[PDB]
Design a protein around this motif. Structure first.
Motif, PDB file in Angstrom:
ATOM      1  N   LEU A  30       0.836  -1.172   0.000  1.00  0.00           N
ATOM      2  CA  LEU A  30       0.000   0.000   0.000  1.00  0.00           C
ATOM      3  C   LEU A  30       0.879   1.231   0.000  1.00  0.00           C
ATOM      4  N   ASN A  31       0.384   2.306  -0.599  1.00  0.00           N
ATOM      5  CA  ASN A  31       1.156   3.534  -0.666  1.00  0.00           C
ATOM      6  C   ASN A  31       0.645   4.476   0.398  1.00  0.00           C
ATOM      7  N   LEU A  32       1.494   4.730   1.392  1.00  0.00           N
ATOM      8  CA  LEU A  32       1.070   5.470   2.578  1.00  0.00           C
ATOM      9  C   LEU A  32       1.699   6.852   2.649  1.00  0.00           C
ATOM     10  N   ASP A  33       0.962   7.757   3.285  1.00  0.00           N
ATOM     11  CA  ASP A  33       1.411   9.124   3.550  1.00  0.00           C
ATOM     12  C   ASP A  33       2.120   9.133   4.901  1.00  0.00           C
ATOM     13  N   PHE A  34       3.445   9.222   4.865  1.00  0.00           N
ATOM     14  CA  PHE A  34       4.243   9.250   6.082  1.00  0.00           C
ATOM     15  C   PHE A  34       4.059  10.617   6.739  1.00  0.00           C
ATOM     16  N   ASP A  35       3.575  10.598   7.974  1.00  0.00           N
ATOM     17  CA  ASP A  35       3.131  11.808   8.646  1.00  0.00           C
ATOM     18  C   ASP A  35       3.788  12.024  10.007  1.00  0.00           C
ATOM     19  N   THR A  36       4.800  12.890  10.068  1.00  0.00           N
ATOM     20  CA  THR A  36       5.486  13.175  11.333  1.00  0.00           C
ATOM     21  C   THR A  36       4.645  14.042  12.283  1.00  0.00           C
ATOM     22  N   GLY A  37       3.421  14.369  11.880  1.00  0.00           N
ATOM     23  CA  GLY A  37       2.489  15.097  12.718  1.00  0.00           C
ATOM     24  C   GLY A  37       1.349  14.266  13.307  1.00  0.00           C
ATOM     25  N   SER A  38       1.375  12.953  13.105  1.00  0.00           N
ATOM     26  CA  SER A  38       0.390  12.069  13.739  1.00  0.00           C
ATOM     27  C   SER A  38       1.022  10.728  14.056  1.00  0.00           C
ATOM     28  N   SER A  39       0.278   9.865  14.738  1.00  0.00           N
ATOM     29  CA  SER A  39       0.886   8.684  15.323  1.00  0.00           C
ATOM     30  C   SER A  39       0.077   7.397  15.141  1.00  0.00           C
ATOM     31  N   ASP A  40      -0.784   7.382  14.123  1.00  0.00           N
ATOM     32  CA  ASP A  40      -1.589   6.219  13.763  1.00  0.00           C
ATOM     33  C   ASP A  40      -1.129   5.714  12.397  1.00  0.00           C
ATOM     34  N   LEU A  41      -0.998   4.397  12.282  1.00  0.00           N
ATOM     35  CA  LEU A  41      -0.781   3.747  11.000  1.00  0.00           C
ATOM     36  C   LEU A  41      -2.129   3.153  10.630  1.00  0.00           C
ATOM     37  N   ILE A 217       6.058  22.829  14.590  1.00  0.00           N
ATOM     38  CA  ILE A 217       6.272  21.389  14.464  1.00  0.00           C
ATOM     39  C   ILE A 217       6.782  21.047  13.079  1.00  0.00           C
ATOM     40  N   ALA A 218       7.641  20.040  13.012  1.00  0.00           N
ATOM     41  CA  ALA A 218       8.110  19.504  11.746  1.00  0.00           C
ATOM     42  C   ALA A 218       7.096  18.452  11.327  1.00  0.00           C
ATOM     43  N   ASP A 219       6.319  18.743  10.280  1.00  0.00           N
ATOM     44  CA  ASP A 219       5.151  17.935   9.945  1.00  0.00           C
ATOM     45  C   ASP A 219       5.116  17.547   8.461  1.00  0.00           C
ATOM     46  N   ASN A 303       2.292  26.705  14.892  1.00  0.00           N
ATOM     47  CA  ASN A 303       3.017  26.906  13.648  1.00  0.00           C
ATOM     48  C   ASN A 303       3.447  25.561  13.093  1.00  0.00           C
ATOM     49  N   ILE A 304       3.393  25.422  11.775  1.00  0.00           N
ATOM     50  CA  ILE A 304       3.664  24.138  11.135  1.00  0.00           C
ATOM     51  C   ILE A 304       4.707  24.285  10.034  1.00  0.00           C
ATOM     52  N   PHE A 305       5.875  23.675  10.248  1.00  0.00           N
ATOM     53  CA  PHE A 305       6.879  23.529   9.204  1.00  0.00           C
ATOM     54  C   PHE A 305       6.504  22.289   8.407  1.00  0.00           C
ATOM     55  N   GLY A 306       5.626  22.482   7.425  1.00  0.00           N
ATOM     56  CA  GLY A 306       5.170  21.418   6.553  1.00  0.00           C
ATOM     57  C   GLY A 306       6.111  21.207   5.378  1.00  0.00           C
ATOM     58  N   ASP A 307       5.611  20.524   4.358  1.00  0.00           N
ATOM     59  CA  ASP A 307       6.452  20.092   3.252  1.00  0.00           C
ATOM     60  C   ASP A 307       7.203  21.236   2.562  1.00  0.00           C
ATOM     61  N   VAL A 308       6.551  22.389   2.407  1.00  0.00           N
ATOM     62  CA  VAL A 308       7.177  23.533   1.751  1.00  0.00           C
ATOM     63  C   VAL A 308       8.520  23.836   2.389  1.00  0.00           C
ATOM     64  N   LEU A 310      10.177  21.632   4.806  1.00  0.00           N
ATOM     65  CA  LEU A 310      10.995  20.447   4.985  1.00  0.00           C
ATOM     66  C   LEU A 310      11.674  19.994   3.700  1.00  0.00           C
ATOM     67  N   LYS A 311      11.031  20.181   2.558  1.00  0.00           N
ATOM     68  CA  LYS A 311      11.614  19.727   1.287  1.00  0.00           C
ATOM     69  C   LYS A 311      12.830  20.544   0.871  1.00  0.00           C
ATOM     70  N   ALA A 312      13.029  21.686   1.512  1.00  0.00           N
ATOM     71  CA  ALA A 312      14.211  22.481   1.260  1.00  0.00           C
ATOM     72  C   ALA A 312      15.420  21.975   2.084  1.00  0.00           C
ATOM     73  N   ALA A 313      15.218  20.936   2.895  1.00  0.00           N
ATOM     74  CA  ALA A 313      16.245  20.448   3.811  1.00  0.00           C
ATOM     75  C   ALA A 313      16.328  18.924   3.808  1.00  0.00           C
ATOM     76  N   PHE A 314      17.454  18.440   4.313  1.00  0.00           N
ATOM     77  CA  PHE A 314      17.589  17.075   4.776  1.00  0.00           C
ATOM     78  C   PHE A 314      17.297  17.136   6.286  1.00  0.00           C
ATOM     79  N   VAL A 315      16.291  16.382   6.738  1.00  0.00           N
ATOM     80  CA  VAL A 315      15.804  16.509   8.107  1.00  0.00           C
ATOM     81  C   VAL A 315      15.988  15.202   8.867  1.00  0.00           C
ATOM     82  N   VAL A 316      16.680  15.304  10.006  1.00  0.00           N
ATOM     83  CA  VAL A 316      16.925  14.184  10.908  1.00  0.00           C
ATOM     84  C   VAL A 316      15.971  14.264  12.079  1.00  0.00           C
ATOM     85  N   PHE A 317      15.182  13.207  12.230  1.00  0.00           N
ATOM     86  CA  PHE A 317      14.305  13.009  13.379  1.00  0.00           C
ATOM     87  C   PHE A 317      15.020  12.041  14.312  1.00  0.00           C
ATOM     88  N   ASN A 318      15.683  12.610  15.314  1.00  0.00           N
ATOM     89  CA  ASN A 318      16.507  11.839  16.232  1.00  0.00           C
ATOM     90  C   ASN A 318      15.682  11.409  17.439  1.00  0.00           C
TER      91      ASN A 318
END
Length: 330
Positions: A30-41, A217-219, A303-308, A310-318
């Motif tokens: 399945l093709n899923l939307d990976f979402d760093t702003g929610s916690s349900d699969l 949030i990084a979302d 405030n939401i740092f969404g795709d606009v 995040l796509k300008a960066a390489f982002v590490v979620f540590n």
């Protein structure tokens, strides 16, 4: 262990990104939307109300030899765009880019709202915020990352979203070939369950940098960049003819414009969002009014740092014991 999977924009505007995910035995992809702003699969499934399925690939747990009903468990979620879904829960084997989790809670949708039905390209969501936000009741469930963490070479995942192009989600390692310069790490608060951090300020185009703390949030599951009204007004004031339209629902600008860049601070570092990333095209087919990719967060409550952004960066979620976020240019 590690995993590495390609993520692909669903349309020409990068409205969202889909990443293939293997669920069950034999695998159902399945093709899923990976979402760093929610916690349900959660997934479209054989249990989804038939009238609410329109082209999505569904998960059929009865065809998976490793699926097991998580007895008594239900889930129900609402998102910031007003969409929602709900259903029951199976556990099953889930693999992302070669990384396998056994016993993952796979939330099977019985109901989805219109926005999901109408998007045939998204088969579900894979949440990557903190498991404290997971909606499964009466026993809260862990995210895919949380379940994988201890097996990972390093307890991290990275987002490398493309502009009008595919990108990559990696789990368990930092690809040092995927960014330029150094990664700047910054503190995270998990108090609201998000990858919440504080930007050190902004610049518009070639303008001077304004030092100011912007909590947000990084979302990866939000398309646009939502910032305080002061900031957003300062940006759009530099675009001739730009205005906030209550009827459209945000700032619009003449499609004939050349948009300035927007810079945001990460500690003493700077991430530059090119102007083209901020163009979301005609508000309706054939219109010469274009929708802006930077919008006010007033009335969102965050405030939401969404795709606009995040796509300008390489982002590490540590996801170490004390989590942090890292940003590099690329």
């Amino acid at each position: 262990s590690t995993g590495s999977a390609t993520t692909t924009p669903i349309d020409s505007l990068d409205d969202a990104y889909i990443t293939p995910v293997q669920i069950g035995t034999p695998a159902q992809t399945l093709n899923l939307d990976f979402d760093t702003g929610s916690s349900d699969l959660w997934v479209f499934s054989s249990e989804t109300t038939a009238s609410e399925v329109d082209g999505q690939t569904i998960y059929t747990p009865s065809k998976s030899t490793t699926a097991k009903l998580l007895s008594g468990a239900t889930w129900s979620i609402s998102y910031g765009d007003g969409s929602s879904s709900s259903g029951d829960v199976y556990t099953d084997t889930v693999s992302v880019g070669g990384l396998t989790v056994t016993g993952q809670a796979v939330e099977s949708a019985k109901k989805v709202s219109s926005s999901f039905t109408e998007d045939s390209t998204i088969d579900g969501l894979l949440g990557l915020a903190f498991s404290t936000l997971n909606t499964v009741s009466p026993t809260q469930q862990k995210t895919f990352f949380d379940n994988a963490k201890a097996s990972l070479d390093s307890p991290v995942f990275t987002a490398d979203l493309g502009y009008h192009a595919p990108g990559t989600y990696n789990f368990g390692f930092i690809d040092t070939t995927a960014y330029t310069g150094s990664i700047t790490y910054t503190a995270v608060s998990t108090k609201q369950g998000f990858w919440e951090w504080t930007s050190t300020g902004y610049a518009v185009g070639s303008g001077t940098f304004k030092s100011t703390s912007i909590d947000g949030i990084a979302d990866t599951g939000t398309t646009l960049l939502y910032l305080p009204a002061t900031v957003v007004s300062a940006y759009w004031a530099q675009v001739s003819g730009a205005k906030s339209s209550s009827s459209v629902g945000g700032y619009v600008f003449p499609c004939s414009a050349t948009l300035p860049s927007f810079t945001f601070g990460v500690g003493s570092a700077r991430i530059v969002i090119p102007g083209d990333y901020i163009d979301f095209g005609p508000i309706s087919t054939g219109s010469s009014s274009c929708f802006g990719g930077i919008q006010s967060s007033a009335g969102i409550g965050i405030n939401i740092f969404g795709d606009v952004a995040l796509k300008a960066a390489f982002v590490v979620f540590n996801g170490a014991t004390t989590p942090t976020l890292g940003f590099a240019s690329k």
